[PDB]
Design a protein around this ligand. Structure first.
Ligand SMILES: OC[C@H]1O[C@@](CO)(O[C@H]2O[C@H](CO)[C@@H](O)[C@H](O)[C@H]2O)[C@@H](O)[C@@H]1O
Ligand SMILES: [Cl-]
Ligand SMILES: [Cl-]
Ligand SMILES: [Cl-]
Ligand SMILES: [Cl-]
Ligand SMILES: [Cl-]
Ligand SMILES: [Cl-]
Ligand SMILES: [Cl-]
Ligand code: NA
Ligand code: NA
Ligand code: NA
Ligand code: NA
Ligand code: NA
Ligand code: NA
Length: 129
């Protein structure tokens, strides 16, 4: 599923991301935009051989099992393929564990580099939330 901006915003809010660990909804939307362009099926291989999956590009090195990432963890206790569903439930719940990990949203490279400290509020402009 390729989510619409406001559609994803609404889905993220219902799942309780809005201001989760102090991060307003626009941050989550902005992150999704630059990680996956709102595409739940987005996958990307990392240099270290691990892979990023889903709307928030969650990494198989630490958070999910894809069966081909040696010496990796599966801290969210899911197959990485669950992160690709049109139902963003798994991605949100795992993301909640990721952002709680001590570094906040800096865990998402594209967030730090492209969203952090900008008007992320603009990402939910005109949405019925
Ligand atoms: O998320 C855990 C850990 O991995 C780092 C390493 O640079 O970022 C990775 O994980 C992200 C989210 O799961 C990926 O989007 C990214 O591709 C990947 O580099 C750290 O930010 C973080 O400590
Ligand atoms: Cl939309
Ligand atoms: Cl919650
Ligand atoms: Cl593995
Ligand atoms: Cl665990
Ligand atoms: Cl889908
Ligand atoms: Cl959903
Ligand atoms: Cl980046
Ligand atoms: Na898709
Ligand atoms: Na915060
Ligand atoms: Na991998
Ligand atoms: Na694993
Ligand atoms: Na292993
Ligand atoms: Na999901």
């Amino acid at each position: 599923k390729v989510f619409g901006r406001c559609e994803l915003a609404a889905a993220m809010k219902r799942h309780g991301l809005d201001n989760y660990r102090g991060y307003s909804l626009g941050n989550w939307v902005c992150a999704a935009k630059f990680e996956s362009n709102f595409n739940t099926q987005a996958t990307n291989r990392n240099t270290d051989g691990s892979t990023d999956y889903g709307i928030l590009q969650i990494n198989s090195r630490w958070w999910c099992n894809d069966g081909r990432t040696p010496g990796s963890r599966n801290l969210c206790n899911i197959p990485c393929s669950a992160l690709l569903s049109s139902d963003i439930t798994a991605s949100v719940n795992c993301a909640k564990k990721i952002v709680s990990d001590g570094n906040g949203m800096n865990a998402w490279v594209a967030w730090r580099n492209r969203c952090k400290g900008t008007d992320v509020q603009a990402w939910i402009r005109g949405c019925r939330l």
